[PDB]
Amino acid sequence: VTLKESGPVLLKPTETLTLTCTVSGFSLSNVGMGVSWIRQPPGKALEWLADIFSNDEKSYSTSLKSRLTISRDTSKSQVVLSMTNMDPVDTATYYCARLANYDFWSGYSRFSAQFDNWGQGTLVTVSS
Amino acid sequence: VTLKESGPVLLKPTETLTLTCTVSGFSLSNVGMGVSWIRQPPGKALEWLADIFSNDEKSYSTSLKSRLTISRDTSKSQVVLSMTNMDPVDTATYYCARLANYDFWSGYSRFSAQFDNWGQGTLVTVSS
Amino acid sequence: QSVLTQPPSVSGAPGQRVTISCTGSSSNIGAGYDVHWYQQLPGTAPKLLIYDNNNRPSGVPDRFSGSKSGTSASLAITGLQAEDEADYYCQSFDSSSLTGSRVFGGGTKLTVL
Amino acid sequence: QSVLTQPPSVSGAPGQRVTISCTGSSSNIGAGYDVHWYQQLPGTAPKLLIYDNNNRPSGVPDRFSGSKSGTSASLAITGLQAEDEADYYCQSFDSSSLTGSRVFGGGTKLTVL
Amino acid sequence: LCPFDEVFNATRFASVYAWNRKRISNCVADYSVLYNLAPFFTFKCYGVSPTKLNDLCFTNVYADSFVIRGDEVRQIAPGQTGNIADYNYKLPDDFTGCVIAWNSNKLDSKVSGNYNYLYRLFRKSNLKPFERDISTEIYQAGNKPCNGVAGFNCYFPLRSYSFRPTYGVGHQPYRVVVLSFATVCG
Amino acid sequence: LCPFDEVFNATRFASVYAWNRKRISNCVADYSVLYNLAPFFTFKCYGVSPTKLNDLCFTNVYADSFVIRGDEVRQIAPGQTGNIADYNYKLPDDFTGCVIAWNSNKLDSKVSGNYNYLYRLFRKSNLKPFERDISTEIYQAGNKPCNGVAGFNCYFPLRSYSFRPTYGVGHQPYRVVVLSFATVCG
Ligand SMILES: *[C@@H]1O[C@H](CO)[C@@H](O)[C@H](O)[C@H]1NC(C)=O
Ligand SMILES: *[C@@H]1O[C@H](CO)[C@@H](O)[C@H](O)[C@H]1NC(C)=O
């Protein structure tokens, strides 16, 4: 299982960010696992952003639901995240993670799913 | 009925502001009315801050309940408002208003009370 | 941001009707709480304008009126004179907290063309 | 700010037990939702450390253990080696929203004296 | 004087669907100090004025007490519509008395939830003014009949409050006393 | 094959206090296609492995269906304790089958509140595993004997869900199917 995000980018303020995650070792059509996005500002705590699953149910951060937008495509195993009206504060390291249940031999449960696999992350900088 | 706030004051950031209202024409011991504080940033909308009544029941803004603190003194007819950890964004015109029921001949209701009387306001400036 | 929302600005010609709206949440206006309207002329403190739904204080001209329907309330001005150019604020009691709250509207700027 | 609360940092001597706590609201941890723990070494992506209350993935040494009690959960480290110097994050599912949410803790910096 | 401690300071209040009704007669009642000194959350008079109740007097006075939701005090008034108004406690459009209410989150609220207080949730038709429904029986929704037990479209008419101290002022319990108005002169 | 559409695609699900129970026998069941292809919210197996259910055979299979709250799905599991576990649907500590749940806010939720779903709130003692109580009689709180009618310390045991589309995932309805496990093979 391997998840890789797109390369680091530099954006102007009020622009629209677009990030792509490529997965391998598992299929996005598998019901037991999904893909989520987490960001970590430099020197601060983690922040969960979005979430997509095998049959296109989507979840977003409550405070950032309006700005965020996530989508997937099973043809090449890619998950795309887009954020509108990017602020200078939004500069952070963006992680692509797999929402899957460890102890998978016992099944899966979306309430208790955890980020068992993480990508190496990409650094997004918003500045003039 | 007349309500007057304290004079304008300039404060450093992180300081603690204290504002006092002197009321006339009515007694704070009257159960039918209370005193409330409203602030308005320059060129922006009004924002209710605090609320105090005859029997010392007190209410505050939900987002600012930790920083706010209000008290009254019936012997000299003044209400004191104090705000801790002042930020530069908090600079605004602070209004002092009477929470009383118009149509007072029909009684009073604390749910339907309105700021029927307002003070002239004071300007609080927060800067280095 | 404010819990109650209003159109940022409304305009009208002299002698013509103008309506300003105010909508709330499941609490406050949606919970049956009354709506009060205030007028703030430039460089002056707010003045009570509508002390209860369709109720008007003394000295306020008859051409001002208000109404409430469901989770929304509105202020209607029949005529339009020179002095009707101030900011008008919607206000109501919000009960979605331990000790209660009072929520103001975003303020509507009225202009006479 | 974060919905789940953790102490900013903890310290302990080598070979001495160290405990890290996590506190939740009426939802998430208070609603019976499981708590997961992650480890983030400097300049590295977070790594799953405890995938369910007192449940440990393969490759994680047995000196790591966890528990849950009411609206609180804790992570306990029996020993203490050089490598135990990373950030430990509490995580749980929060159900106080239309589509659900996943909430991280504030992060605890563990230091070895 | 007059038994107002038995009404305002009673240890236990009745549910709104079973509101109490105490006749006040053959007494001298001084409403002026009650209005001026007692700090209630709400004191609204409709057919009378609170500050001049003493010069008037009446053949009889009725005091009704019940506990309702915090934002549900709005519909204790003439001409109001709502769950309490249609199904629990209807007040006449020409009501002449006063309505008194205050917050009782310190007494009627429990951590586990105070299921002590019920409110009628389903009924066949709106109540007459000053009429109450004590009997509880399964309410038929839809067109299928009811065998007398709860089921798919058969509901228990009484829905319970669950007062907890963290519910917020909208849901916190409120104790309401409704006064209806020459044996009682000020 | 075997009637799983009668269980998972039924129009109406039972209340948790009156959960349904259907015996599954004399059929071939393809649990693998159900597990991998059907996108449920939760598919947890405790005594068996979901991906290898086809090679075992059992004397009989029982499928239990009911509707519960969103965060109330947690206590449908062995060794769990909670209102559903003690008073509504107790699951054995050695449970061998699987637990399947999916959100049904599109069907079981109404703007006015779906009062068709009830849950047992008060009971004298916890349930034995796989036992249910249909009878609803007034529950005695405190120590005063009850006359058979709701009152001060007398409660109606069944508390109703009031599912609304805006409740959030915590209180949204969830349809739960519990499978309990040589006439049935894969
Ligand atoms: C009720 O008790 C309070 C206790 O302070 C007392 O002041 C009041 O006079 C009593 N009677 C009424 C009607 O409130
Ligand atoms: C239920 O209906 C859905 C509709 O798409 C179908 O895919 C499924 O096979 C049916 N049966 C079960 C057990 O879900």
Throw out a few tags for this protein.
heterohexamer; A: 128 residues; mainly beta; Immunoglobulin-like; seven-stranded mixed beta sheet; four-stranded antiparallel beta sheet; 12 strands; 52% strand; elongated; C: 113 residues; six-stranded mixed beta sheet; three-stranded antiparallel beta sheet; 9 strands; 0% helix; globular; binds 2-acetamido-2-deoxy-beta-D-glucopyranose
What is the element layout, followed by pairings?
The complex is a heterohexamer, with two copies of chain A (128 residues), two copies of chain C (113 residues) and two copies of chain E (186 residues).
Chain A: E1 2-5, E2 9-11, E3 17-24, E4 33-40, E5 47-52, E6 58-60, E7 68-73, E8 78-83, E9 92-100, E10 107-109, E11 114-118, E12 122-126
Parallel strand pairs in A: 2-12
Antiparallel strand pairs in A: 1-3, 3-8, 4-5, 4-9, 5-6, 7-8, 9-11, 9-12
Chain C: E1 9-12, E2 18-23, E3 35-40, E4 47-50, E5 64-69, E6 72-77, E7 87-94, E8 101-104, E9 108-112
Parallel strand pairs in C: 1-9
Antiparallel strand pairs in C: 2-6, 3-4, 3-7, 5-6, 7-8, 7-9
Chain E: H1 5-8, E1 22-24, H2 31-37, E2 42-45, E3 57-58, E4 61-68, H3 83-88, E5 98-103, E6 118-120, E7 139-140, E8 154-155, E9 158-160, E10 174-180, E11 184-185
Antiparallel strand pairs in E: 1-4, 2-5, 3-11, 4-10, 5-10, 6-9, 7-8
Bound molecules: 2-acetamido-2-deoxy-beta-D-glucopyranose (2 copies).
Textual characterization of the structure:
The complex is a heterohexamer, with two copies of chain A (128 residues), two copies of chain C (113 residues) and two copies of chain E (186 residues). Chain A has 128 residues and is mainly beta. Chain A has no helices and twelve strands. In chain A, strands 2, 4, 5, 6, 9, 11 and 12 form a seven-stranded mixed sheet that branches. In chain A, strands 1-3-8-7 form a four-stranded antiparallel sheet, with no helix packed on it. Chain C is mainly β. Chain C has strands at residues 9-12, 18-23, 35-40, 47-50, 64-69, 72-77, 87-94, 101-104, 108-112. The termini of chain C are far apart. In chain E, 39% of the residues are buried. Chain E is mainly β and 186 residues long. Chain E is 9% helix and 23% strand. Chain E has a single domain (5-185), classed as Spike protein, C-terminal core receptor binding subdomain (Alpha-Beta Plaits, 2-Layer Sandwich). The chains are: A mainly beta (128), C mainly beta (113), E mainly beta (186). Chains in contact: A-D, A-F, B-C, B-E, C-E, D-F, E-F. The A-D interface holds A 36, 38, 44-48, 51, 57-62, 95, 102-103, 111-112, 114-116, 118-121 and D 2, 33-34, 36, 38, 45-48, 51-52, 55, 57, 89, 91, 93, 97, 99-107. The complex binds 2-acetamido-2-deoxy-beta-D-glucopyranose (2 copies). One 2-acetamido-2-deoxy-beta-D-glucopyranose is lined by residues 4-5, 8-9, 38 of chain E. One 2-acetamido-2-deoxy-beta-D-glucopyranose (NAG) binds at residues 4-5, 8-9, 38 of chain F.
